[PDB]
Design a protein around this ligand. Structure first.
Ligand SMILES: O=C(N[C@@H](C(=O)Nc1cncc2ccccc12)c1cccc(Cl)c1)[C@@H]1CC[C@H](C(=O)N2CCCC2)O1
Ligand SMILES: [Cl-]
Lengths: 305, 297
């Protein structure tokens, strides 16, 4: 019993965190095999930030300009290249702590663990989701650039995010490990703003099934809904449209609890209309959207209470 | 910017998790140097049950390697299995007993394999609101200070309300619990007042100031109000501990107490604080200072 926002054990990622310095700038790098991946903005100067020409800044650098530190050991840089918004530093030593890994690009609504680091040293681990507006509501301070997001399903680490910047609203933007940004963001200090955010509907439904699994049914009703009627109501509360794919994905939880997806949608519609009336669901007074259907199946029991 | 329930990096603890099997029971063990610590309920008159066991009855597995048990002893509710190999991944560590209100990280494990890490607090009723399934027994709670891992909790059982109970690493239970199948219930819980205040300071640091007012209160008047809302009494020690955050934000502790008093008597009025519609009590004053400063390990 119980339901917590749970992160993956961070050990396999901790053994990959390094410190990358270029001139006066220091940030974090990810050391996998003989390559260190880091945000390309480490090569910028205090002016460059507005309209940096990364190709022009990089051509002026040599291998010895990049200082890479793994613990108390200096790694020698023997090559460098840029792939989109990520700088790849070829080093002379392969990381002996390199886990089995993949680089995966996630879609909005997906969750991942973040190992927040400063000066190549891990400070904390937390769980979060890629928002529909492609930002993440993380907890980052200056020097956290280069911290990574990941999932560890089985013994393989799937790297999905690298931190690049904080937007004016306090939310965060970054790239996949191939340097492609999530969202319409650029690594420039130009006026950029996150689009209007929405609630991840499929995740709220999954979390309502998790509450039924742990023994709570106060929010259910005797009604059902069509998918179309549910979306017309949901859009009025800034909820993402629920697609037939989302309904298919919720199938296992529907079978385990005995509650049809469109009947759980009818209960969600009623919760949006009425609020909670002093009650909570899994210790929360708000509708929680940072647990996917897969996270619920992983954390909750296979036997409903 | 941002404020999350953050756990310590779990790597130093992951390298200590092992699987302990005795007969039909399998649970988790903590392998430090040449000793494996695990709940004694893996074997009730525990002395009588233990005397009938030999070293070869305990099967200990570290990854795909079988560890040979060469001795066994009991310390309170923890079983200590002497093994033939010292753990080469043993970090610098201490066994510490925490007080209610203090927070720690939990590395939840099944069959000696870590599955997740989460942050939580020791409730005033000595239970923890964790996330554990059958097979989680032996999972541990910890904090990190520089390079030293302070082990403070080992999971033993789930209570009928869904909350969890366990011991320090010396086998002494937190709370009036015993390690057996019998009618046990968690006492009425209270809110950790000093932690809610710390989280209100964290909200001010992150730009949330709608709840601030021009008023102050005496410590006595605040406690008379807080006792009415099932909040733990706020002591002068708690006020002293909140000193740094008071100096950083410019809001005196008793000034912030008058804000909490208004939130308790009037609610949030459709508003949230740090993305929450409830008053959050699982961040200590130190957790707030650490997260809003960037301390590393
Ligand atoms: O804000 C800065 N850096 C980046 C940033 O956004 N970093 C941060 C990330 N997360 C949380 C943060 C919270 C508080 C402050 C910073 C945070 C940033 C800014 C603009 C565009 C990009 Cl891609 C990256 C400052 C100002 C320039 C300096 C910097 O990064 N330099 C590069 C080389 C010369 C100095 O550090
Ligand atoms: Cl995805």
């Amino acid at each position: 019993s119980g339901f917590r926002k749970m992160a993956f054990p961070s050990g396999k990622v901790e053994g990959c965190m390094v410190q990358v310095t270029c001139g006066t700038t220091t940030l974090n790098g990810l050391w996998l095999d003989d390559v260190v991946y880091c945000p390309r903005h480490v090569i910028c100067t205090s002016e460059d930030m507005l309209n940096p020409n990364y190709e022009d800044l990089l051509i002026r650098k040599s291998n010895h300009n990049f200082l890479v530190q793994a613990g108390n050991v200096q790694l020698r840089v023997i090559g460098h290249s840029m792939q989109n918004c990520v700088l790849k530093l070829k080093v002379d030593t392969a990381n002996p702590k390199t886990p089995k890994y993949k680089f995966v690009r996630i879609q909005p609504g997906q969750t991942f663990s973040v190992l927040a680091c400063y000066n190549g040293s891990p400070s904390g681990v937390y769980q979060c989701a890629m928002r529909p507006n492609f930002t993440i509501k993380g907890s980052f301070l200056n020097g956290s650039c280069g911290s990574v997001g990941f999932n560890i399903d089985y013994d393989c680490v799937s790297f999905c995010y690298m931190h690049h910047m904080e937007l004016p609203t306090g939310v965060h933007a970054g790239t996949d490990l191939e340097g492609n940004f999530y969202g319409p963001f650029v690594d420039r200090q130009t006026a950029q703003a996150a689009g209007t955010d929405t609630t991840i509907t499929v995740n709220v439904l999954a979390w309502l099934y998790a509450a039924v699994i742990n023994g709570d049914r106060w929010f259910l009703n005797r009604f059902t809904t069509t998918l179309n009627d549910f979306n017309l109501v949901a859009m009025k509360y800034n909820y993402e449209p629920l697609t037939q794919d989302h309904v298919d994905i919720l199938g296992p939880l529907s079978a385990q609890t005995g509650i049809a997806v469109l009947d759980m949608c009818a209960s969600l519609k009623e919760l949006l209309q009425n609020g909670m009336n002093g009650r909570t669901i899994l210790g929360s007074a708000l509708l929680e959207d940072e647990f996917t259907p897969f996270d619920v199946v992983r954390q909750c029991s296979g036997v409903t209470f």
